[PDB]
Design an enzyme around this catalytic site. Structure first.
Site, PDB file in Angstrom:
ATOM      1  N   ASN A 163       0.800  -1.225   0.000  1.00 28.82           N
ATOM      2  CA  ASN A 163       0.000   0.000   0.000  1.00 28.82           C
ATOM      3  C   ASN A 163       0.830   1.271   0.000  1.00 28.82           C
ATOM      4  O   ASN A 163       0.341   2.265  -0.499  1.00 28.82           O
ATOM      5  CB  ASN A 163      -1.042   0.008   1.116  1.00 28.82           C
ATOM      6  CG  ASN A 163      -0.538  -0.289   2.488  1.00 28.82           C
ATOM      7  OD1 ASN A 163       0.605  -0.686   2.683  1.00 28.82           O
ATOM      8  ND2 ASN A 163      -1.406  -0.134   3.461  1.00 28.82           N
ATOM      9  N   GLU A 183       5.251  -2.901  11.853  1.00 30.48           N
ATOM     10  CA  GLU A 183       4.084  -2.040  11.637  1.00 30.48           C
ATOM     11  C   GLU A 183       3.065  -2.995  11.052  1.00 30.48           C
ATOM     12  O   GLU A 183       3.227  -3.456   9.913  1.00 30.48           O
ATOM     13  CB  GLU A 183       4.395  -0.922  10.662  1.00 30.48           C
ATOM     14  CG  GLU A 183       5.491  -0.005  11.122  1.00 30.48           C
ATOM     15  CD  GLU A 183       5.708   1.190  10.217  1.00 30.48           C
ATOM     16  OE1 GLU A 183       5.404   1.100   9.005  1.00 30.48           O
ATOM     17  OE2 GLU A 183       6.158   2.236  10.733  1.00 30.48           O
ATOM     18  N   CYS A 241      -3.409   0.502   7.261  1.00 32.79           N
ATOM     19  CA  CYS A 241      -3.425   0.002   8.639  1.00 32.79           C
ATOM     20  C   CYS A 241      -3.977   1.079   9.582  1.00 32.79           C
ATOM     21  O   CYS A 241      -4.724   0.750  10.502  1.00 32.79           O
ATOM     22  CB  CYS A 241      -2.032  -0.453   9.070  1.00 32.79           C
ATOM     23  SG  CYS A 241      -1.239  -1.619   7.924  1.00 32.79           S
TER      24      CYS A 241
END
Lengths: 475, 475, 474, 474
Positions: free
Chosen positions: C153, C249, C283
């Site tokens: 992404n 992450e 996220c």
């Protein structure tokens, strides 16, 4: 009962040829006398301190912290004994005076532990230029030397310890000059450091008349730093007498309490009354003017009035909220501000009454900027309410003051309160709470004529230390 | 090619009714004129700066950094053009003058990036007392307001930029007062900030006669901070005129070079000569006295002598090591120190010669502390060698000086060198290297009469900022 | 469609095998990337460890100059890089160009943050009197070789946010971009190569997870793994790292707690921008609204009106909702939508799917028994859960295995701060959508959302160690 | 010989089974500790997670007061705890009492270091102009439940160095002492219980590794594992931790680099004190001398004279060399001595063993083909390796899998700093033996010597996380 007090000079207790008798401002009772030092005796104090500096700065931080912890323990043990005399000496409530001695012990302990974790820095030459990449700077903290600490009458133990302990942990030697009205308390604080075994000359006291030693103690070339709390004109003089030498000044305040339309008015009134009338308004960091939006002004004034009417007015021994003022001149000055406000059309919501130097708490409404009470620091139990139409007007009026110690903002809109805080020319802004110096770990400073330098335990340590850089090339 | 220069005042270039013509100290060539501002014109500069302050401090750090980066780029582009005039104006070597402009650009870029990473702190009330555990202080940095920056003749661009960029990134507005001998260079530096598009009133210049505006520029109530480099007596006066206001002073030095018995004498001589005779000794941080152990003094003096004899003596355009001094008075003063040393029995290892204000480099050996040259800052190409028998004696002689800028220690024993460094009353100690201000990220400060405050890029930013605390209770 | 190469020790290398990359929105062939073998991964790591000594001994200024030149090249080629990035991960053309510009900003900020690296001098006399002449000169040092693994992404932005902080500190780097995003990762590497980054200091690895997935992480040459991606992959990396330092992450299920005194129009604006940005494939995204029942009907209506305005289409047309990264991702999102519909949730906006282009679905009356209340979709679907008390909102928010960020919409900030203290998240945004920025701020996740603290200065601190030199002053 | 109990939720609990502990030097029965089951470990962790909320919401001052009260109780009972500790791990009586006093100092220092915990305010305007009104209020927070695992060689000191920094930060703790050292760990727990530490805030676990070894680390209630012990156990803990934060203090093979210009008498004094302290059973001991051949004969002769003066005997007589922790440890040390003798090393002091009391062995002419050049003995044996260049000393020093600390003995400090930059260790001591102290200084190991940075303030930072609250100023 009334003792003859002595100055701590190079590990010895010394009297002077002349002395100053101290009386209780509330009753006129004789409390004792303090030496009236000459300039030659001030020279002896400074000579002893500079001589003691080399062995004090070479001690470890642990060893210096141990003396301060020992001094603070003695203060806690004798808090009732020191607090009882302090109460009479500056007409402060008995319990409030004992609390002051306990708060001093807390600040001494906190500065001893803050100062011992003193760290330096290592800087890289390669951060600035490639050719100096092997060059590093080992930057370590060092004391400034001799600190002259001048405490005020309203906090003669607390605002003596807040200067002494941060200076001592850093390796500085100190000379405490307490105010004359408060010198017995300052000398009682010195007895705790002497009983703790503070080395001879590391901590000393000076007492005397301003006409004999006032400028002399500051001008003296032995003094490396001046740390003072007191009036703005005296501070202004100290700044020029210091020349190039570093200073810390804690001067007057005219702290404003901005009350917006969405404020909790009962909470605002509670904080404004506790802050404005604490120790009969004889505090620099007190709420000294209410800048309230006109829509909520009538209800806020009514809530402040009900609380001001409940305040006890009496003697320090009876723990009264409003006790007699420090002297006749202070009471006369406050009465003049009350008279100017009455003559210019302000509404007295609580009645003025004076018995000796015991002035009852006066609340004024409809105070305008043409009245002296809108601007001048009274150091008395009088509070003006100034109605405003916009928050821009409240900021404008707040910033028009020559003082900028602290401000209070009572509102439920915090992003807006933060935006207002950015525009206020003050050191600290309290949201939904009265202005206050505490907690003592927080920075305490004043913008404009309210001061110079940043106080608060770690900031006081940083201010009374310098830096020594050692640079070398790695091979 | 003598131009009529103008002051930058509120985004406009202004002449004054009167002007001061600037001449090259080495040749007498007319270089141009600068305005001779009146006190009313100084008032206009300060009014413009205080008006520009609100919109400048509310800009983001990124926006303020962009202006500083753009100005530094313009300085790099015009380094030859600025450096050529700077060289003639203060009789500095052509290459050394161009280097000064490049170093100014480096400091401006470093300050723009250092200042934009400005951080605050969050303090816990619960660190000091349990009852305040829900109370936190959001402490953020704020500008002090208007900074008056006063640059010196010897570094009129570099020690103007080292004050301007750290003040500007922090949100302060600035007024640069360059020295009269150096005002063309200070105004050329201002043209770079004006071309960078610095907002009107954010950066301004003042030029004039000390008898008309000298004390006036400092005393003015609009000035919130004075950042000055120059002589000790002028700095002493500035300290008094500042009153309670914050200052940063970079004053004289008499930097000692302590050479021990185990030193690399060829390296010590190389560093001692480069440092002592750079810009004909017209630098505050320059080796001004050698304190050498008698066992190695004859060989060290011989090695210093051979290198001093190699130094070129001539004109700035020819990049001579020793160029003419700033003025006749400076050369007369240096000649007087050389005469006092000769008359008191010091050994002249290199001959004294003077042609106009071009003094040849004089090296003296067997200098005793009854000679003026052992203590007084010459600002000329003369270096005394003082022989000692112990390191205790070297420390004692080094510390007896009223100055304490930097010191050098030449030895192979670093734990001992660190112990000596702790005892020296200076800001910085260089091990096996000449004293120097660089790298500009390192702290630069002076003990005793050498200054007030700590310079070096991050330290300059911290000095010209204050703190605003916002305290609230978490619910 | 070009044949891309990996940067290995200052050279551009093809492998025997390659992986062809197609545009997720159109199926267009964009090119191929090498399919490295384990022996070629060994060559990358051998090159990096060899380059480490000369790189760490350079000055901070010299290392910062390379980063600044790489960032300048990225700004120059932002349209060229952004155009390919847009097609490679079905991101809007303008949003893809913005990502490349944001990467250049992070690189430059890391270069200037890292060069002001400072050490500390500690006093022995702070602890005991006998050690008062003893001091510790504590300086920062690189950890060594950093393996940076960027996500699909943000294949350029969350590659640069790992590379620049690692490089300024004196570390050498190997970038392993995702396969869907490897052309972008290699275009980012071309900028560092053109900047003249020394051979072996910065390298790239591309390949199939079945051939080199675990191999790149378990390799003893790697001293630090800095990864962004799914929680299960992150969990595996933690085990494969052993004792070595990591930065993870991972997933998020960020909640937007809306109280009765909230500005509902502002809450709806922020909730929709945060939840539907890049079709919810982030996220840090508002993944569940926890609203007080008294204001839930009006908030739901305001979110609905804004969701109906979102454009649904192709990346080239800068649509708000673009096709999802792959068929599996869209199938998974459709399953969550089906589960909510079957369990009685109210679909406020209609479900439609054309290929892997799912229209934005807003659900109301979502209960904790629905999968959509807990599972990270990585698709344009947002549940609204109604709560009776703020205690219930905190309880439901903390019941999640994720703890990346949270949003609180209210006019009572002292209360919002009290709520923030109880939320098990890294960051809490007051009256604003959750977001990673500004990149100087800390970015971290509690529970299964991550390990370590990101944000420029925090990334530099994480990928550095200390070296203490202690001696006695005499 | 008392029957000891575990501190569990403010109560002292026995288990169905127990482990009897004997003095390694004499075989004397000292008492027994509970042999906890996995269900009893669950009860400890359930108690700690329940106690976490009320502990973390206490002020820093209140948490510091408990720590100060516990440290005062340790100083009061230093002789009583030290006497048992001495017998339990065959440590000299005076050295064992000193360990308790040093633990009290670390507890006091951590209480005062931790209470001055500060956060940061970051400006959005530092990164981008559009976010100039956005600020981040970043505050520290506890990680949650810390599992502290102390080693046999410092069972009180390296339990308190983990417990106090975790407790001041607002974490709850479970101490798992080693079985040989569990009576001392439980004596430390009695001081915290007498200080009035709230129920569940501080707890102990004792048991067999075969029943609860992996279980205590794997448990999902544990948020951080702080361990001191062997490298293989640490390697396993790193995997079992997964993504969770850890702090590992593992083996060392600290080298003492002696250059030609060194003060050989000072070097020998520090080398012998460091190498043979507690019979070499310390991770920070000097474990190999890398000496320049020109000064090797004189240095070896000076080390030999000092080794021959070391007393060899019982802990109650404060002997320098006491019996090793167990038979297996003494067998392992004897094997390293045998390998060195068989490969041609020169034994400068004779090998003698009486039970598990090994006499101090000094070896010269040790080569890199001998196990003693690389393996951590945890016994009184020291190899002297001769080198021709400083480059060779750095290369041999760095070839070790360990990198805890190093010593450099020389009169050229700028060169010593250059060498220190190249050594792959946490700390480098100049003209002094390697050592953990002072406890305010960072303590860390590179390579297989550890994970994370210890030292009081570094400990507190490691066992804390950050909570960012972001809002816009209006």
């Amino acid at each position: 009962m009334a003792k003859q007090y002595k100055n701590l000079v190079n590990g010895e207790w010394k009297l002077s040829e002349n002395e100053i008798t101290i009386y209780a401002p509330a009753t006129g009772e004789e409390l004792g006398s303090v030496p009236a030092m000459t300039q030659a005796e001030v020279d002896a104090v400074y000579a002893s301190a500079k001589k003691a500096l080399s062995d004090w700065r070479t001690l470890s931080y642990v060893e210096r912290a141990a003396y301060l912890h020992k001094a603070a323990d003695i203060l806690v043990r004798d808090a009732e004994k020191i607090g009882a005399i302090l109460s009479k000496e500056v007409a402060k409530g008995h319990k409030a005076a004992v609390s002051e001695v306990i708060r001093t012990a807390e600040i001494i302990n906190y500065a001893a532990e803050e100062g011992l974790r003193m760290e330096g820095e290592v800087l890289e030459g390669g951060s600035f230029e490639a050719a100096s990449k092997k060059k590093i700077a080992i930057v370590r903290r060092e004391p400034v030397g001799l600190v002259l600490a001048i405490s005020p009458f309203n906090y003669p133990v607390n605002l003596a310890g807040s200067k002494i302990a941060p200076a001592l942990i850093a390796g500085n030697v100190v000379a405490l000059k307490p105010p004359t009205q408060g010198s017995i308390s300052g000398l009682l604080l010195a007895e705790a450091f002497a009983e703790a075994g503070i080395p001879a000359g590391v901590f000393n006291t000076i007492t005397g008349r301003g006409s004999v030693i006032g400028d002399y103690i500051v001008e003296h070339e032995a003094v490396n730093f001046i740390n003072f709390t007191g009036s703005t004109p005296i501070g202004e003089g100290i700044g020029k007498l210091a020349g190039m030498r570093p200073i810390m000044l804690e001067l007057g305040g005219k702290d404003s309490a901005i009350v917006l339309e969405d404020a909790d008015l009962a909470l605002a009134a509670k904080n404004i009354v506790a802050g404005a009338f604490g120790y009969s308004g004889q505090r620099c960091t007190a709420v000294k003017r209410v800048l309230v939006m006109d829509k909520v002004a009538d209800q806020l004034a009514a809530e402040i009035k009900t609380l001001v009417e409940k305040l006890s007015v009496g003697m320090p021994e009876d723990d009264a909220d409003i006790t007699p003022l420090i002297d006749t001149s202070a009471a006369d000055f406050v009465e003049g501000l009350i008279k100017d406000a009455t003559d210019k059309g302000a509404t007295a919501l609580t009645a003025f009454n004076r018995e000796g130097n015991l002035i009852s708490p006066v609340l004024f409404d409809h105070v305008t900027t043409d009245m002296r009470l809108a601007w001048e620091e009274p150091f008395g139990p009088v509070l003006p309410i100034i109605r405003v139409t916009t928050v821009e007007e409240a900021i404008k009026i707040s910033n028009e003051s020559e003082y900028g110690l602290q401000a209070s903002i009572f509102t439920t809109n915090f992003p807006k309160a933060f935006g207002i805080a950015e525009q206020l020319e003050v050191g600290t802004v309290h949201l939904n709470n009265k202005t206050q110096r505490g907690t003592d770990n927080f920075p305490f400073l004043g913008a404009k004529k309210s001061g110079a330098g940043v106080q608060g335990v770690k900031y006081s340590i940083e201010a009374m230390t310098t830096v020594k850089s050692v640079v070398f090339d790695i091979q």
